[PDB]
Each structure stands twice: as structure tokens, then as C-alpha cells.
């Protein structure tokens, strides 16, 4: 009585009556996502039906993590949880989890190729940095930031869509199987900002192998001083590769491309650094001139059985 069903492609959405006019906007392997009008909040929301959360150990573990993390994080530059529910009435029948979220207007792919001024370029990057800083404070390090999981609204607001890992934009320390720290996400922000300017993917690696090539081709070979940090089986391959001398950032991002300018180039040369120990940090990036104009202190500061995962998840839903 409180629920009704609507067919979305091959999927049946059974949702609380407050959610009306479901239209699909996309799909991931986590599940299908519709925009709906929520009659009680009087605004549009995103509703995600989880893909077979108890299918196996990996699904359940990932469903549980998303649910727990969404509930703890709370910040204007991160997609927020509004509601979670299931149409099933007991742990026994428990099948489906629906997550209701804030809805934006577009992902960043369709804004990134267009011509952005410095003010909109800088302010989106500021919001991205604010969202990243908050994720880090909650002990969440993303590592998978890309234009398709950053979303924007027609008022120039921006939110980070999800929580990432646990290949164009991924950091060296990630594609080389090294350790990483917080500023692994700064690389991705550099790759995105670099894309906002050139008008195209900076390191469009056809494969993981071509991926490191394109990086070092553009930026040069990393110094000793990094190889030394490399595990032997990969330290060798990286070491065997042909020595690529690096261009300059004036060369990579020339004045021909800008509408500042010299600033976006400085920040870029500080973010797009292969050796993370020389890469700038989120806090420094925030107070960096090209960014610090917008500053506001209130924004910028186990194993289980499938049945046990199913029980844990069910608690989170209730």
C-alpha cells in the first residue's frame, strides 16, 4: 500500500509512493539510477536500486560499505544520503535496497570540453577540493576521481558523486601498485584541471602499459628518488623503459589555450607531479592563489557469511 512498482527497462522499481515519475539517468555496476520527484520534499532526487547486494561476498561487502560511509559523511560538495528503504518486510524476504540521494544536473564530462573562464574554472576546483578534504578527514581516500563521478548543477555548484576505490586520471602510485597518501587525489584534480584547459584527456592511455608511457612521455622520467621506492618486479620494468625527457608546463599548457593563466599553470605543475612527496597537498592547494579567492572556513574545514552481511545491511536500512 505504501509502495508501488514501475518498470525501468528490464528492472522493476518498487518504491515508496512519495517518489514519482522515475526516469533512468544512468547505470553503474552498483546498480540502476533514476531521477524521481519526491512529493514530500518537493524536489527531484536520485534513486539507486542496489544490484544484487547479497549475490556474493564482494557485493555484500560493497553494499555495506556504501551504506555506512554515506551515513557518516555530510558536506555540501559530496552527494548526500536522503533516505534508504526496502520493500521487503523481514530479514527472511529481504532482497532489495534503495538509496535515495541528491540529484544534480550533469556530470563534468559535458562541461569540461566547453570553454570555461577562470572564475568558473577556479570555483569548481575549489568545491572539488572542499569535497576531497572532507572525505579525507573522514579517512576516505578516493583514488578514482574522474569527470564522470563529479557532478554539477546549473547554478555552478559541484558535488563529488561517490567514495572511490576499495584509467586516465589515476595517480602513478596507484597504477604502479605503490603505497599512496591523501595527495594521490591531487593528481586526479590536476588531470581534470589539465583537461579543462587543453580541451582533452592529458594521458589517454590505451592500456595500463601505454598509460605510464604517456605520463612519463609528457612529464619526464621520475628521478632516482622514486624508482628506489619501487617494488623489484615493477622497479625493473619502469627502469628498463626508454628514458623520456620532460617538456615544460609552458610547453604542455601554453598561453594559446587560456582565456591568472600563469597561475593555473603553476598549480598544475604542483599537482601533476609523479613523485607524490613533491606533489602539493589539499590544504596547500586550497590556499593557493588560483583557488584561495573563494575561501570560506565553514566549507573548507572483517569477514562475514552472506547471511551475516545480509543481517548487517538490513540493520543499516532499518
Amino acid at each position: 500500500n505504501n509502495f508501488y512498482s514501475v518498470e525501468i527497462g528490464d528492472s522493476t522499481f518498487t518504491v515508496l509512493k512519495r517518489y514519482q515519475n522515475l526516469k533512468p539517468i544512468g547505470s553503474g555496476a552498483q546498480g540502476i539510477v533514476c531521477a524521481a520527484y519526491d512529493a514530500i520534499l518537493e524536489r527531484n532526487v536520485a534513486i539507486k536500486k542496489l544490484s544484487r547486494p547479497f549475490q556474493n561476498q564482494t557485493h555484500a561487502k560493497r553494499a555495506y560499505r556504501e551504506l555506512v560511509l554515506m551515513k557518516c559523511v555530510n558536506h555540501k560538495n559530496i552527494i548526500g544520503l536522503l533516505n534508504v528503504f526496502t520493500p521487503q518486510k523481514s530479514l527472511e524476504e529481504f532482497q532489495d535496497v534503495y538509496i535515495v540521494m541528491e540529484l544534480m544536473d550533469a556530470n563534468l564530462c559535458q562541461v569540461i570540453q566547453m570553454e570555461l573562464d577562470h572564475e568558473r574554472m577556479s570555483y569548481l576546483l575549489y568545491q572539488m577540493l572542499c569535497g576531497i578534504k572532507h572525505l579525507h578527514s573522514a579517512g576516505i581516500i578516493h583514488r578514482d576521481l574522474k569527470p564522470s563521478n563529479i557532478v554539477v548543477k546549473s547554478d555552478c555548484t559541484l558535488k563529488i558523486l561517490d567514495f572511490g576505490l576499495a584509467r586516465y586520471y589515476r595517480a602513478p602510485e596507484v597504477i604502479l601498485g605503490m603505497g599512496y597518501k591523501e595527495n594521490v587525489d591531487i593528481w586526479s584534480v590536476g588531470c581534470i584541471m589539465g583537461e579543462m584547459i587543453k580541451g582533452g584527456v592529458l594521458f589517454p592511455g590505451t592500456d595500463h602499459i601505454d598509460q605510464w608511457n604517456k605520463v612519463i612521455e609528457q612529464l619526464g622520467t621520475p628521478c632516482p628518488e622514486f624508482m628506489k621506492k619501487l617494488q623489484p618486479t615493477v622497479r625493473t620494468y619502469v627502469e628498463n623503459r626508454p628514458k623520456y625527457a620532460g617538456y615544460s608546463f609552458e610547453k604542455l599548457f601554453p598561453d594559446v589555450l587560456f582565456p591568472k593563466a600563469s597561475q593555473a599553470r603553476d598549480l598544475l605543475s604542483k599537482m601533476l607531479v609523479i613523485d607524490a612527496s613533491k606533489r602539493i597537498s589539499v590544504d596547500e592547494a586550497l590556499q593557493h592563489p588560483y583557488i584561495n579567492v573563494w575561501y570560506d572556513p565553514s566549507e573548507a574545514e572483517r569477514e562475514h557469511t552472506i547471511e551475516e552481511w545480509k543481517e548487517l545491511i538490513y540493520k543499516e536500512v532499518m
Partner: peptide, 9 residues
């Protein structure tokens, strides 16, 4: 100052 309030989609 004054943050943008519109973006073109």
C-alpha cells in the same frame, strides 16, 4: 568575490 551563480550545460 561574488562566486559564479550560473554554469552553461
Amino acid at each position: 568575490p561574488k562566486r559564479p551563480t550560473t554554469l552553461n550545460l
